[PDB]
Design an enzyme around this catalytic site. Structure first.
Site, PDB file in Angstrom:
ATOM      1  N   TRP A  76       0.809  -1.162  -0.127  1.00 19.72           N
ATOM      2  CA  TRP A  76       0.134   0.387   0.116  1.00 19.72           C
ATOM      3  C   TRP A  76       0.787   1.038   0.048  1.00 19.72           C
ATOM      4  CZ3 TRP A  76      -4.147  -1.729  -0.811  1.00 19.72           C
ATOM      5  CH2 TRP A  76      -4.777  -2.776  -0.847  1.00 19.72           C
ATOM      6  N   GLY A 132      -6.805   5.311   1.567  1.00 20.60           N
ATOM      7  CA  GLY A 132      -5.786   5.524   1.655  1.00 20.60           C
ATOM      8  C   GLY A 132      -5.924   6.120   3.199  1.00 20.60           C
ATOM      9  N   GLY A 133      -7.320   6.776   3.874  1.00 19.25           N
ATOM     10  CA  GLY A 133      -7.901   7.382   4.634  1.00 19.25           C
ATOM     11  C   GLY A 133      -7.647   9.234   3.892  1.00 19.25           C
ATOM     12  N   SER A 135     -13.039   2.558  -0.155  1.00 18.53           N
ATOM     13  CA  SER A 135     -12.333   2.907   1.172  1.00 18.53           C
ATOM     14  C   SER A 135     -12.541   4.530   1.161  1.00 18.53           C
ATOM     15  CB  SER A 135     -11.086   2.586   1.283  1.00 18.53           C
ATOM     16  OG  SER A 135     -11.258   3.236   3.477  1.00 18.53           O
ATOM     17  N   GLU A 189     -14.338  -6.424   6.742  1.00 15.23           N
ATOM     18  CA  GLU A 189     -13.581  -4.941   7.242  1.00 15.23           C
ATOM     19  C   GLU A 189     -12.854  -4.319   8.019  1.00 15.23           C
ATOM     20  OE1 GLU A 189     -13.673  -3.542   4.285  1.00 15.23           O
ATOM     21  OE2 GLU A 189     -15.327  -3.921   3.916  1.00 15.23           O
ATOM     22  N   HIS A 218     -10.026  -5.794   4.479  1.00 15.90           N
ATOM     23  CA  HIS A 218     -10.682  -4.615   3.913  1.00 15.90           C
ATOM     24  C   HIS A 218      -9.203  -4.297   2.598  1.00 15.90           C
ATOM     25  CE1 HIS A 218     -11.811  -0.364   3.848  1.00 15.90           C
ATOM     26  NE2 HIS A 218      -9.797   0.180   3.364  1.00 15.90           N
TER      27      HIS A 218
END
Ligand SMILES: *[C@@H]1O[C@H](CO[C@H]2O[C@@H](C)[C@@H](O)[C@@H](O)[C@@H]2O)[C@@H](O[C@@H]2O[C@H](CO)[C@@H](O)[C@H](O)[C@H]2NC(C)=O)[C@H](O)[C@H]1NC(C)=O
Ligand SMILES: *[C@@H]1O[C@H](CO[C@H]2O[C@@H](C)[C@@H](O)[C@@H](O)[C@@H]2O)[C@@H](O[C@@H]2O[C@H](CO)[C@@H](O)[C@H](O)[C@H]2NC(C)=O)[C@H](O)[C@H]1NC(C)=O
Ligand SMILES: *[C@@H]1O[C@H](CO[C@H]2O[C@@H](C)[C@@H](O)[C@@H](O)[C@@H]2O)[C@@H](O[C@@H]2O[C@H](CO)[C@@H](O)[C@H](O)[C@H]2NC(C)=O)[C@H](O)[C@H]1NC(C)=O
Ligand SMILES: *[C@@H]1O[C@H](CO[C@H]2O[C@@H](C)[C@@H](O)[C@@H](O)[C@@H]2O)[C@@H](O[C@@H]2O[C@H](CO)[C@@H](O)[C@H](O)[C@H]2NC(C)=O)[C@H](O)[C@H]1NC(C)=O
Ligand SMILES: *[C@@H]1O[C@H](CO[C@H]2O[C@@H](C)[C@@H](O)[C@@H](O)[C@@H]2O)[C@@H](O[C@@H]2O[C@H](CO)[C@@H](O)[C@H](O)[C@H]2NC(C)=O)[C@H](O)[C@H]1NC(C)=O
Ligand SMILES: *[C@@H]1O[C@H](CO[C@H]2O[C@@H](C)[C@@H](O)[C@@H](O)[C@@H]2O)[C@@H](O[C@@H]2O[C@H](CO)[C@@H](O)[C@H](O)[C@H]2NC(C)=O)[C@H](O)[C@H]1NC(C)=O
Ligand SMILES: *[C@@H]1O[C@H](CO[C@H]2O[C@@H](C)[C@@H](O)[C@@H](O)[C@@H]2O)[C@@H](O)[C@H](O)[C@H]1NC(C)=O
Ligand SMILES: *[C@@H]1O[C@H](CO[C@H]2O[C@@H](C)[C@@H](O)[C@@H](O)[C@@H]2O)[C@@H](O)[C@H](O)[C@H]1NC(C)=O
Ligand SMILES: *[C@@H]1O[C@H](CO[C@H]2O[C@@H](C)[C@@H](O)[C@@H](O)[C@@H]2O)[C@@H](O)[C@H](O)[C@H]1NC(C)=O
Ligand SMILES: *[C@@H]1O[C@H](CO)[C@@H](O)[C@H](O)[C@H]1NC(C)=O
Ligand SMILES: *[C@@H]1O[C@H](CO)[C@@H](O)[C@H](O)[C@H]1NC(C)=O
Ligand SMILES: *[C@@H]1O[C@H](CO)[C@@H](O)[C@H](O)[C@H]1NC(C)=O
Ligand SMILES: *[C@@H]1O[C@H](CO)[C@@H](O)[C@H](O)[C@H]1NC(C)=O
Ligand SMILES: *[C@@H]1O[C@H](CO)[C@@H](O)[C@H](O)[C@H]1NC(C)=O
Ligand SMILES: *[C@@H]1O[C@H](CO)[C@@H](O)[C@H](O)[C@H]1NC(C)=O
Ligand SMILES: *[C@@H]1O[C@H](CO)[C@@H](O)[C@H](O)[C@H]1NC(C)=O
Ligand SMILES: *[C@@H]1O[C@H](CO)[C@@H](O)[C@H](O)[C@H]1NC(C)=O
Ligand SMILES: *[C@@H]1O[C@H](CO)[C@@H](O)[C@H](O)[C@H]1NC(C)=O
Ligand SMILES: [Cl-]
Ligand SMILES: [Cl-]
Ligand SMILES: [Cl-]
Ligand SMILES: [Cl-]
Ligand SMILES: [Cl-]
Ligand SMILES: [Cl-]
Ligand SMILES: [Cl-]
Ligand SMILES: [Cl-]
Ligand SMILES: [Cl-]
Ligand SMILES: [Cl-]
Ligand SMILES: [Cl-]
Ligand SMILES: [Cl-]
Ligand code: NA
Lengths: 526, 526, 526
Positions: C80, C114-115, C196, C323, C436
């Site tokens: 990631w 990525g939030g 996400s 998740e 997730h």
């Protein structure tokens, strides 16, 4: 002094006092080139500027037409005869506007009846100053050509293509589109209304692609194109054009030569031979009528109606209680406006011959079987009543109901009335009842004029009808919302609800003439 | 003398006497640049002005194509063979218009069948002068390229992109959009109609975004793109293009070189090797057909249909009672047009091999199991009838029903017919029944011509069918409204109502071939 | 050599062999002015012509962002992390197109998660060459700014207005509107998809009036704006901007001076203080996220959703079975990727503290009460499973279900999936289940590549998912129509039907997590 600038020039009108108020009337404005000489039997041609203040201060000439001389001196018949000079130069219209000038008034355009053979917009029962005064609508009405001069047809041939009088009406509707805002009118709120052949004409403008955008809603009083007198077949039209030619020594081998020859005849020789273009006629004969010309009318209109090809909008449709009686004194044996006309079975049968020329014997027995099962055989006016109902149901009532049924199946609101008031002043005798043509004076408001010797109940009936017609035109809904009136339901296949119009109180009923029209509508078409 | 000005130049037509009236025919108007030389296998290129009066007084060349030489001398087969010279220069169309010239006539555009390998618009059974005369519609028909020359595909490569013959049809539809008002036509009322591969083509113009705005409604006679012969996979097309190359010594390593090589071959060497591009064929082989090219056809058309991506409009779809019989005499063992073809169980099984090349053994047993449970095993024509039904249900009938079912689920009116009249003049023998291709002469009106030796019941049937097709095109509803005819219900999933067409009287029925098509449609796709 | 002319200049791409075919990739095309210096924290500014052939032959820089250093050397986490240099100059996008160049291809635009603090379009699991090759769609993906640099907000102040990274995504969508036809794309068929935070972003473009006309349909994988981590309140944002200022010695009295000061800091000092702008964080902290800025987002988005103010179109929404597990190893006590993480009741309670910072004691007991009534208390993995479900249901699953419920109530088709396949190659341990982020490689087609060591069942699952996503984008309906697949029903309030995605066979079920989400959705919002 009231001058309005139109696309084609200026027009001066005249002020009228009505009910302590003022209406401005512009009588006899021209809307096409006079269709004379080389333009005879042709589609109307557009009009070029005068310039020039055109004085629209009197009714124009009526179109050439035979006249009803059956009852010289008699108001009942002579009231329908033209009241301006006859002339081929008759393509004019009339505008009545409220005063002060409205801002964006709804427009009512009247199309007269007369069998497509007669009529004129200047009749007293078509005077639109009461409507303009009372409802603040603008009223327009036009003369269109009638008889051979308006409807002679040599199919596909632009020298006599047919439907000319329907194209005159159409060019008048354009004139309103182009010009009525100048008089204070809303070209986006235009309702056509017409009686008998005028109604049939309204119903064909509903089917005509070229009229689609020239109006908003439609009112049909005592008529619709599916009535048996309202459309001439191509066969009949051809036979009739040639018969006319023959009778005027205009027979040729080349068809354009026939027309050229006929263009040389005098208005009068044409009029005089119209009645004979047909081996046998009836009091309801329409010798020169609408035809399927591939232009105004693209296909047999019964097919267009069945298959839903027509302007999608609201319609208001109605008939009178005794439609067929008026016609019986123009040739049925034993009938007279001057006695009670109690006829016999044998006379009734002779009458069917007058009205159903041919018509197999079986065809005519079948009418007799359907209309002469009395309840019971006692009553002497039995056969006299039956002949009138035969003629009214066949010619007017069932075709109006069937039109309304078929139109409404495609999803539009339709309203149906049954007019059942006999005018206190009718000059015709009592046995003729609530006659064809005699709702008209109520729609135009004549009973609103007290100086006129209508009863008080008739003033009130007329006032209500005027409001209902006006709300229909302005809002698509013929309600009288203020005086706790009966609410007028839409007419649907299935319930077939209609409103009765009379002086006492109006009812909602269902399935007018159900048993009769099943006969005319399903079986008779022998 | 009749000259019409088109966007590309003037065209002169010719007058025709039909049924005591006149039709104007403009035969062989060009609609694209001849696709010769460097344009071979390419999409059709638009046409530039001649100027110049183009004389459209005879049918043009037909496109190159193999011919059916199975029954030399025999009318039943030879009637389908081209009747003008063959030539790569074949991109012309025909227009028939009523006289006098119509004002805004509905247009019918015919797309011929022939397996995408053959056919021409000049055939006698496709002559559109009867329709134009009788219904006052305009009829248009076009030649489009067929075989490798119309459908060779080297996917994604614009030198041979595929579907060229479908792009020829499309450019013809544009020509009607741009030019038909000049002949008196309404480009906003255009109905496509086609039979077999011509129908399949109509069904793909329904799926093609580039055809969406080139027409209004669609008629599919005996065909739809989901039929098993109507779309070539990309796999098969590649294999076939390369096989053709190989067979003409045109194999290359560079694909554009393959095409360049093939562009040097003579029409004839290409035609001669078409039949062999495939290891085994059937009498129903379509060696070069529509493909998913990413242009005309954006995705596998079964996915487009299932997921509702197609022109939303009314469709009229139908099939004949004995679709599959015509094919059995082109290779099934024991079958002959010259005897009653009573075949045996073992012959039936050999026939399945002819028609289902491979086709697991289990696949073929399953057909046999489904079609040979007799009621009962007595009847000698048992197996002969069964093979014809197998071939018709699989190839034509169930795919037409399933198309109609899936199309109608998205909310459009669809009408389905089952044609069950055997022509009194059919040259093929009785056992072949109501054959594929033999409704066509009824749709085009040939039986309306009395001089022609059809029965009276056939004139009447044809007259009715012509009216129903014409009302469908003009109004989206295939009713015959005047002669107390059976009303044609829409076809819905759920009831699946259809109308039978025969000389006695037409019925409404439901769920045609229910048990059979459950087999072809759900199970068979082994 | 492939050069495309764009509104801003020419771009050269590169050819890629994929599955024996070719895709053209244009990696790293710029779409805005680099947001450096005085443009830092401002909305992206449009790009001016280079001219010039821009070489788009490699991925561009990723935006500045902190990196995950928890498991150095470990593929599960490091996969990631960014794989191109970090730089404020990161506003580029990637285009993959089928070869040959499509005619009017549907476009898929990917927005990474990525939030909102991390991510990049160049990751291997986001490579869109498989989709372009296999489905002949065009795939686009863009880098947008993340962390404070993308979302710092000083409300109403155009020096730091907030949502900058959402405006970067938006300017990328415009670029596709203006430019994608040039690459062969249909700007009228554009589907956004994202996972996400990328999904949350898709859901906000549904609410944003300025995005309304930049796309057709939307796919939301594991995220929606109503998730508790996805929108920062104005209160929090202010506190956080000031805390950042304070921590970088940028506190001022004048707010524009704060921003000016921060514009002088080095990317690194900003990144280093991001984590601390908040007194306590969780493994799911989103310190700098979307805010209601009065521009991109006109009102609290929960109000917009409830009251139906959003783009009316189809949505495809889904979640994975486990998740919440991924997050538990970033700080929950007793949890490790390197053992089975059997934790105790007391540990479970400590975990709630990690994930629900504050959160009354009663709030946290209530979670415990809802999730720890075992059936039964025997099972040692009881508490370990419960903490993962708590975290997944709260953060992802119930907010996705509630979004879908509320969106669909306004009349649009919505489709919901529950992804339950654990990748055969997952590097994370078994107890973490279907994590997730791990549907993504299936959606992008990585398992279609056999050389890659996925099982055969996984190739088939991926192939199906790709088809379903592609049909959704092209036709608004995520069916796989060819292989007798389970039909995917729309999701309605009332039945709440969803489709399970797994290798064995997919089911239709109802009311996913009914009892759990009633807790999170109705009660918890303590
Ligand atoms: C078409 O016309 C003929 C009638 O011929 C007519 O000649 C015209 C000039 C006119 O004077 C007219 O009165 C005269 O009839 C119709 O056929 C007619 O049927 C009667 C039956 O005996 C004969 O006496 C008429 O003469 C006969 N026509 C002739 C003279 O040949 C015919 O019916 C009509 N077609 C229709 C009704 O459409
Ligand atoms: C009602 O009058 C009709 C109409 O005909 C008559 O009109 C009357 C008012 C009278 O002046 C009479 O001279 C005139 O002809 C009568 O029908 C007529 O009946 C008479 C009696 O023999 C016959 O000779 C006529 O043929 C017939 N007229 C026609 C041609 O229709 C009718 O009898 C009379 N009926 C009553 C009073 O009930
Ligand atoms: C793709 O083509 C081959 C057939 O190869 C062909 O060569 C062509 C030029 C043509 O002449 C054709 O008749 C010939 O078959 C198909 O495979 C074939 O299968 C049969 C089975 O025995 C062999 O005899 C063929 O030779 C064999 N091909 C060869 C020669 O290698 C193949 O089926 C076809 N693919 C399809 C059906 O799409
Ligand atoms: C119906 O005819 C078929 C077709 O084949 C034949 O056509 C006939 C009209 C006749 O001229 C014959 O010479 C010609 O071959 C017959 O099928 C054939 O059956 C014959 C009898 O042995 C065989 O020899 C053939 O192989 C076979 N033809 C093929 C190749 O299909 C058929 O038997 C006949 N059946 C009847 C009369 O019911
Ligand atoms: C708004 O911020 C304060 C925290 O103040 C912060 O100073 C920043 C520069 C940063 O370093 C940060 O870590 C530090 O907390 C929040 O209130 C805090 O609550 C705790 C509870 O004991 C205190 O220890 C903090 O110091 C205290 N703030 C101070 C120092 O006054 C406050 O919660 C936050 N508001 C929110 C959560 O929106
Ligand atoms: C599973 O491992 C966790 C994670 O913490 C440990 O990671 C291990 C793989 C091991 O290397 C160990 O050194 C490392 O700290 C264990 O949680 C830990 O439990 C230990 C045992 O006392 C405590 O000392 C730690 O505080 C605690 N780690 C933290 C900070 O979360 C866990 O016990 C272990 N559980 C099993 C095997 O079920
Ligand atoms: C006049 O009104 C115009 C719209 O007319 C509508 O409203 C009613 C009159 C109704 O009956 C419908 O016929 C119409 O749809 C409007 O567009 C014009 O601007 C107005 N013109 C003026 C006031 O000058
Ligand atoms: C010709 O009609 C045009 C509209 O055509 C409609 O009406 C029917 C023909 C129907 O089948 C539909 O296909 C169409 O919607 C109209 O716009 C044109 O102005 C007309 N052209 C003329 C008369 O010149
Ligand atoms: C490309 O198609 C355009 C219309 O696109 C529609 O069709 C589908 C792609 C669907 O997903 C919808 O998004 C759209 O409504 C059309 O207007 C253009 O002309 C076409 N452009 C070309 C072929 O150059
Ligand atoms: C037109 O007629 C009006 C009204 O009677 C009159 O006043 C006016 O002078 C006339 N104008 C002319 C001369 O035409
Ligand atoms: C018919 O006569 C008219 C007279 O002008 C002429 O125009 C037309 O061409 C003639 N047609 C024929 C040959 O019948
Ligand atoms: C309503 O009734 C009143 C008197 O009560 C009458 O004067 C008025 O004209 C009526 N209005 C209509 C439109 O009928
Ligand atoms: C075209 O063909 C017509 C019809 O046969 C003929 O009359 C005309 O003269 C021709 N014109 C030329 C010379 O092409
Ligand atoms: C294939 O050959 C054609 C011949 O013109 C050429 O245009 C094309 O570039 C070639 N491509 C290759 C290298 O295969
Ligand atoms: C209707 O039937 C009549 C005869 O009764 C026939 O002549 C006519 O052609 C028919 N019309 C249609 C369209 O079938
Ligand atoms: C751009 O990059 C390409 C691909 O590697 C290369 O062939 C080309 O020469 C480059 N052009 C320049 C000089 O930027
Ligand atoms: C805040 O300082 C900035 C610095 O340029 C200035 O533009 C702004 O007017 C100041 N406003 C006040 C008085 O707080
Ligand atoms: C359908 O299944 C076939 C094999 O039976 C497989 O090869 C193909 O990829 C599948 N198509 C889709 C879209 O799943
Ligand atoms: Cl009077
Ligand atoms: Cl008797
Ligand atoms: Cl009695
Ligand atoms: Cl009654
Ligand atoms: Cl023939
Ligand atoms: Cl056997
Ligand atoms: Cl039997
Ligand atoms: Cl059946
Ligand atoms: Cl990976
Ligand atoms: Cl406890
Ligand atoms: Cl337990
Ligand atoms: Cl659950
Ligand atoms: Na609680």
């Amino acid at each position: 002094d009231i001058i309005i600038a139109t696309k084609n020039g200026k027009v001066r009108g005249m002020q009228l006092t009505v009910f302590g108020g003022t209406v401005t009337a512009f009588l006899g404005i021209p809307y096409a080139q006079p269709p004379l000489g080389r333009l005879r039997f042709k589609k109307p041609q557009s009009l070029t500027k005068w310039t020039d203040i055109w004085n629209a201060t009197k009714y124009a000439n009526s179109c050439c037409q035979n006249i009803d001389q059956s009852f010289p001196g008699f108001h009942g018949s002579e009231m329908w005869n033209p009241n301006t000079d006859l002339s081929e130069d008759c393509l004019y219209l009339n505008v009545w506007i409220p005063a002060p000038k409205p801002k964006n008034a709804t427009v009512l355009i009247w199309i007269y009846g007369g069998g497509f053979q007669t009529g004129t917009s200047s009749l007293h029962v078509y005077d639109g100053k009461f409507l303009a005064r009372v409802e603040r609508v603008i009223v327009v009405s036009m003369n269109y050509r009638v008889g051979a001069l308006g409807f002679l047809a040599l199919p596909g041939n632009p020298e006599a293509p047919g439907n000319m009088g329907l194209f005159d009406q159409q060019l008048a509707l354009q004139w309103v589109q182009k010009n009525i805002a100048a008089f204070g009118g809303n070209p986006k709120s235009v309702t056509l209304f017409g009686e008998s052949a005028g109604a049939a004409s309204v119903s064909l403008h509903l089917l005509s692609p070229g009229s689609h955008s020239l109006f908003t809603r439609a009112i049909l009083q005592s008529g619709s194109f599916n009535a048996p007198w309202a459309v001439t077949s191509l066969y009949e039209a051809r036979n009739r054009t040639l018969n006319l030619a023959k009778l005027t020594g205009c027979s040729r081998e080349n068809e354009t030569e026939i027309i050229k020859c006929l263009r040389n005849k005098d208005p009068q020789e044409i009029l005089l031979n119209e009645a004979f273009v047909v081996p046998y006629g009836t009091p309801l004969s329409v010798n020169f009528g609408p035809t399927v010309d591939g232009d105004f009318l693209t296909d047999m209109p019964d097919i267009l109606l069945e298959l839903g090809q027509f302007k999608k909008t609201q319609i208001l449709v109605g008939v009178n209680k005794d439609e067929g009686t008026a016609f019986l004194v123009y040739g049925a044996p034993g009938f007279s406006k001057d006695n009670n006309s109690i006829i016999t079975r044998k006379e009734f049968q002779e009458g069917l011959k007058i009205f159903f020329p041919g018509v197999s014997e079986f065809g005519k027995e079948s009418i007799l079987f359907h209309y002469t099962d009395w309840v019971d055989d006692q009553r002497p006016e039995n056969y006299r009543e039956a002949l009138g109902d035969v003629v009214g149901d066949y010619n007017f009532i069932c075709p109006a109901l069937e039109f309304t049924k078929k139109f409404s199946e495609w999803g539009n609101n339709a309203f149906f009335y049954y007019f059942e008031h006999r005018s206190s002043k009718l000059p015709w005798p009592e046995w003729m009842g609530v006659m064809h043509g005699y709702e008209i004076e109520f729609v135009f408001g004549l009973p609103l004029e007290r100086r006129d010797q209508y009863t008080k109940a008739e003033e009130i009936l007329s006032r209500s009808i005027v409001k209902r017609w006006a709300n229909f035109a302005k809002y698509g809904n013929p309600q009288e919302t203020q005086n706790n009136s009966t609410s007028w339901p839409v007419f649907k296949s299935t319930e077939q609800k209609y409103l009765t119009l009379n002086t006492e109180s109006t009812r909602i009923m269902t399935k007018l003439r159900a048993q009769q029209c099943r006969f005319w509508t399903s079986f008779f078409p022998v």
